Design a protein around this nucleic acid. Structure first.
Length: 65
RNA sequence: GUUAAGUUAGAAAGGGCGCACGGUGGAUGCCUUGGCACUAGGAGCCGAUGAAGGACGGGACGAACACCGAUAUGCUUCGGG
């Protein structure tokens, strides 16, 4: 997964992919708060995903600049 | 069993001296995760590309330490295991 963010398209698809898993994160926090989420570690790994694959965007932008 | 007058062990409310067994308390013994004085070498600055230092906040519960900064208990990317 540490490579796919570079391998796939430059910037376009990562954007709505960010918004999609941010949707997932919001849903995860809501089910956590109401006390129904089971697979907890999902909450960690989605945030890790967000961090890494917007870090990729930042480094790509600065490198291009 | 009476006179009569003489003589003395006897006691324990409690207490004193030793003996035994306990409590408390943290002395002494032993130890060290800290500290002191120094030797040899490196280094002797940081800051508007925002410092030193903080407040606030981040974790599958929530406080505190430590780490971190809304990419928040971390990440990408060269290595070592």
């Amino acid at each position: 997964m540490k490579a796919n963010e570079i391998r796939d398209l430059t910037t376009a698809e990562i954007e709505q992919k960010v918004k999609s898993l941010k949707e997932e994160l919001f849903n995860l926090r809501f089910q956590l708060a109401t006390g129904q989420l089971e697979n907890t570690a999902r909450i960690r790994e989605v945030r890790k995903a967000i961090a890494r694959m917007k870090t990729v965007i930042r480094e790509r932008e600065i490198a291009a600049n």
